[PDB]
Design a protein around this ligand. Structure first.
Ligand SMILES: CC(C)CCC[C@@H](C)[C@H]1CC[C@H]2[C@@H]3CC=C4C[C@@H](OC(=O)CCC(=O)O)CC[C@]4(C)[C@H]3CC[C@]12C
Ligand SMILES: N[C@@H](Cc1cc(I)c(Oc2cc(I)c(O)c(I)c2)c(I)c1)C(=O)O
Length: 546
């Protein structure tokens, strides 16, 4: 009936917003390159969405509750689509991309800001509506379906990003027969704008069903303004709601931190390429998370689980997920031998901080750059920071490979390009890591829908959307924003070799200490998870008491 139609429309809106998010994440680097803006303005573009979302989420979730919720959702979709289309606008006004053979970025800012605004009503009003009119058993399953869509959607955004990056930026504007560069060329820019047009159109189409959906299923603003403060105290005077908010905030501090640096952990700890890390996370781990969320919804529906049972399932999923995550401490690889950083040039195992001599006797004759990181794998099994630092004098191109010779440090003499592959059982450790991380992701996500149901049922019904708004504001502000920052700071304390930008400032870290990285990355996650587990126990105790 009308409830099923609303569920389908909300699922399509979730898909549209997720696809836009994925495409934006895939193309932000191309946008930075095309517009010739510094990384600070790139972070500003990425953060305009969040400014827009956080500034109006509370107002929308509170006042929109008594209004026509389907129509507010449709208006939000329209604003989302307009903002998405605004990002592609500068393509139609800037000059042709000239490659070696400026103020239009504000639009990219403004459009993203509109996206942040247009997303705000979708979750608080959409879920509350779903919870108001579905039967008690079916609500959890419907919410699970919607959240599964939200989890899976960005993969399509990244696929569209790749497809549009395969096309030239000035396609349709310029004859392509006069262009001598290929996607492999570093000067190539893809059709970044095309995906924004597609996503904006999809978002505008997503708004259409919400103008035919009813407000309810089987002066006032000034009066809501007066009751705003009493309603806030009602939500935060509620102990189950407040403690579940704290529990979720701490658990998401753990989870955002773990997820953000999981690709880098895979690449650094297990010697995998960035592409392989992204493939295993996006194509294996994310489906496991989606399956966990959906199965939590299924379990809530099938066994008619109550609020107390939902709290128990949330606690159990957290407990067993973090216990499984503990086993990752034993799946560790040792540091690869890097001359001067992890080992000395004589092949002696780990020197200390006070012994990091990028220059040695075997490379004193050569004037090599310290800041440059062009690692090569020598025949001796020791990785060197650069071929110059090994005294390599001749280089020959054999097929797709480049081989150095007469490398004095190696002979204490050939070397190929890249880091030496990790040999002693590290691929097996990485396979175990993959299996355990997939299982852990599924197990942790198995409690996602139960906690959501706990939040929705612990409060008086008329506050649902408002509570959902506040929850969303909390997770974003107290977990989503801060956790990547301080996780990054603590992890970067394990850096052995800093990359340097053209201005002399530090760039991305090139070599980490594997043991310190593993300890920090896993321990911070587990400690936050343990705090969350204790808070969840408190939530369960109060639920039993009341
Ligand atoms: C927490 C934040 C900071 C990052 C969240 C990680 C994931 C949600 C995202 C980030 C990078 C994304 C991946 C990077 C790009 C790709 C390639 C993309 O297209 C391809 O398969 C490559 C095509 C080609 O070979 O050219 C498929 C999805 C995937 C794995 C993405 C899936 C979703 C990922 C893992
Ligand atoms: N920009 C996105 C980034 C993001 C996506 C997912 I999906 C996610 O959820 C999980 C949970 C577990 I457990 C995992 O192992 C993995 I991988 C992802 C988290 I946290 C963050 C967002 O913030 O929504």
């Amino acid at each position: 009936g009308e409830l099923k139609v609303f569920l389908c429309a909300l699922s399509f809106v979730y898909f549209a917003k997720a696809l836009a998010e994925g495409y934006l994440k895939s193309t932000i680097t191309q946008i930075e390159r095309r517009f010739d803006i510094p990384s600070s303005l790139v972070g500003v573009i990425d953060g305009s969405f969040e400014i827009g979302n956080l500034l109006v989420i509370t107002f929308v979730s509170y006042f929109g509750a008594k209004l026509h919720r389907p129509k507010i959702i449709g208006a939000g979709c329209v604003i989302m689509g307009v903002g998405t289309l605004l990002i592609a606008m500068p393509q139609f006004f800037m000059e042709q991309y000239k490659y070696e053979r400026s103020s239009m970025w504000i639009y990219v800012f403004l459009g993203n800001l509109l996206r942040g605004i247009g997303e705000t009503p979708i979750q608080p009003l959409g879920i509350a509506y779903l919870d108001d009119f579905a039967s008690e058993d079916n609500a959890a399953f419907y919410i699970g379906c919607v959240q599964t869509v939200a989890i899976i959607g960005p993969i399509f955004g990244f696929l569209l990003g790749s497809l549009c990056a395969k096309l030239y930026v000035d396609i349709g504007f310029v004859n392509l027969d006069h262009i001598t560069i290929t996607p492999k060329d570093p000067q190539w820019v893809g059709a970044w704008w095309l995906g924004y047009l597609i996503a904006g159109i999809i978002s505008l189409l997503a708004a259409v069903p919400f103008w035919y959906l009813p407000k309810s299923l089987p002066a006032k603003i000034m009066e809501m303004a007066r009751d705003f403060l009493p309603s806030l105290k009602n939500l935060f005077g509620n102990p189950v709601y407040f403690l579940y908010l704290c529990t979720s905030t701490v658990q998401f501090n753990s989870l955002f931190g773990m997820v953000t640096y999981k690709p880098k952990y895979i690449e650094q700890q297990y010697g995998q390429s960035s592409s392989r890390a992204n493939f295993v996370i996006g194509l294996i781990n994310i489906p496991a998370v989606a399956l966990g969320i959906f199965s939590g919804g299924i379990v809530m529906k099938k066994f008619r689980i109550s609020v107390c049972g939902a709290a128990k399932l949330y606690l159990g999923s957290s407990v067993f997920g973090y216990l499984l995550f503990l086993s990752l401490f034993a799946l560790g690889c040792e540091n690869s031998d890097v001359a001067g950083l992890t080992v000395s040039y004589q092949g002696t195992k780990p020197v200390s901080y006070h012994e990091r001599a990028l220059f040695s006797d075997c490379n004193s004759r050569c004037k090599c750059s310290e800041t440059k990181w062009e690692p090569m794998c020598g025949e001796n099994g020791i990785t060197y920071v650069s071929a110059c630092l090994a005294g390599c004098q001749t280089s020959n191109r054999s097929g797709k490979n480049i081989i150095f010779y007469n490398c004095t440090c190696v002979g204490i003499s050939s070397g190929i390009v890249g880091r030496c592959q990790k040999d002693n059982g590290c691929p097996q450790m990485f396979l175990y890591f993959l299996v355990i991380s997939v299982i852990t992701s599924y197990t942790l996500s198995l409690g996602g829908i139960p906690g959501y149901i706990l939040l929705l049922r612990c409060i008086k019904p008329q506050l649902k959307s408002f509570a959902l708004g506040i929850y969303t504001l909390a997770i974003r502000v107290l977990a989503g924003i801060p956790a990547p920052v301080y996780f990054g700071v603590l992890i970067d304390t394990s850096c052995l070799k800093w990359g340097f930008k053209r201005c002399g400032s530090r760039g991305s870290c090139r070599l980490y200490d594997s043991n310190v990285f593993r300890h920090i990355y896993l321990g911070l996650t587990v400690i936050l998870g343990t705090v969350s587990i204790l808070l969840s126990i408190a939530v369960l105790f109060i639920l039993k008491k009341n």
